[PDB]
């Protein structure tokens, strides 16, 4: 049995790609790459595609549970938010790919116990002005869930205690009267 069965995942996942081509629609630009629901199918996809560090600036990968669009206004994201990891240009080289793989593994591996159900997806943004990785969750007001996810994710990335990462609500980000978005939680 272990000699021939694929190892199912708790959830079915969809990998998306976005190219920020300003001369086309954000509908023609967003793109389902593929869906998978086993560990082996995850690896076959990951091995076939570019590392984030090799994408052109302005591109995203997004891994979301099947049925959740990688867009904050989706029913399952609209009341939620994201644990944001910001990276500088030198971390593109040292940390981006390793942090993104670890993020994928936390999602597909259900690494947040009961609270993995609050996870919607994850996004990596490749940008000239700084790369970003984030885990999106369903409800900002689920304080225990959001906090546990943040604590485990920080530990999995190996970030030291002196580094603070913030959780920002999507609605706050969309409607901020200023430059920076305020946090709902930090870890």
């Amino acid at each position: 049995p272990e000699h021939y069965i694929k190892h199912p995942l708790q959830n079915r996942w969809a990998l998306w790609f976005f190219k920020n081509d300003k001369s086309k629609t954000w509908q023609a630009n967003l793109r389902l790459i593929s869906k998978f629901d086993t560990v082996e199918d995850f690896w076959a996809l990951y091995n076939h595609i570019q590392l984030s560090s090799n994408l052109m600036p302005g591109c995203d990968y997004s891994l979301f549970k099947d049925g959740i669009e990688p867009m904050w206004e989706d029913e399952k994201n609209k009341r939620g938010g994201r644990w944001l990891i910001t990276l500088n240009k030198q971390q593109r080289r040292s940390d981006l790919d390793r942090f993104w793989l670890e993020t994928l593994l936390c999602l597909i591996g259900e690494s947040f116990d009961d609270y993995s159900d609050d996870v919607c997806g994850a996004v990596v943004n490749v940008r000239a002005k700084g790369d970003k990785i984030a885990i999106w969750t369903t409800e900002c007001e689920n304080r225990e869930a959001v906090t546990h996810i943040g604590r485990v994710y920080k530990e999995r990335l190996g970030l030291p205690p002196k580094i603070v990462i913030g959780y920002q609500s999507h609605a706050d980000t969309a409607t901020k009267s200023g430059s920076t978005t305020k946090n709902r939680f930090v870890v």
Binding site: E40, W43, I108, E110, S116
Partner: peptide
């Protein structure tokens, strides 16, 4: 229950 895979296992399937 729930299907949980730790990091070591998920790496051994690659």
């Amino acid at each position: 229950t729930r299907i949980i895979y730790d990091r070591k296992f998920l790496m051994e399937c690659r």
